Amino acid sequence: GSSGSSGGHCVAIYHFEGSSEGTISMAEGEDLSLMEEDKGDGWTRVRRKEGGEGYVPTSYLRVTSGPSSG
């Protein structure tokens, strides 16, 4: 079957390196798996295909918002 999961889709907008003792790194335009939403906090937790998840700034997250993904 297809390879995906209906729930939350987001991609890194700008290069964000997780230096702090509690953050994840992503690549400009990289696919991520939304896990923990951000409520007026600006912090979102996403997972990586490999197996790494951390708290990234929503500002650096652009909701794919692209249905009918062929």
Swiss-Prot record:
Record's comment on post-translational modification: Tyrosine phosphorylated. Also phosphorylated by PKA.
Tissue expression pattern: Expressed in brain, colon, heart, kidney, liver, lung, megakaryocyte, ovary, pancreas, peripheral blood lymphocytes, placenta, prostate, skeletal muscle, small intestine, spleen, testis, thymus and trachea.
Taxonomic superkingdom: Eukaryota
Segments for region (Interaction with DNM1 and WASL): 8-64
Protein name: Cdc42-interacting protein 4
Induction field: Induced by adriamycin treatment and this effect is counteracted by HGF/SF. Expression is reduced during differentiation.
Record text on subunit structure and interactions: Interacts specifically with GTP-bound RHOQ. Interacts with DNM2 and PDE6G. Homodimerizes, the dimers can polymerize end-to-end to form filamentous structures. Interacts specifically with GTP-bound CDC42. Interacts with AKAP9, ARHGAP17, DAAM1, DIAPH1, DIAPH2, DNM1, FASLG/FASL, GAPVD1, LYN, microtubules, SRC, WAS/WASP and WASL/N-WASP. Interacts with the ligand binding domain of the thyroid receptor (TR) in the presence of thyroid hormone. May interact with CTNNB1 and HD/HTT.
Region (Interaction with WAS): 9-64
Compartment annotation: Cytoplasm, Cytoskeleton; Cytoplasm, Cell cortex; Lysosome; Golgi apparatus
Family membership: Belongs to the FNBP1 family.
Domain writeup: The F-BAR domain binds the phospholipid membrane with its concave surface. The end-to-end polymerization of dimers of these domains provides a curved surface that fits best membranes with around 600 A diameter, and may drive tubulation.
Region (Required for podosome formation): 8-64
Species for this entry: Homo sapiens
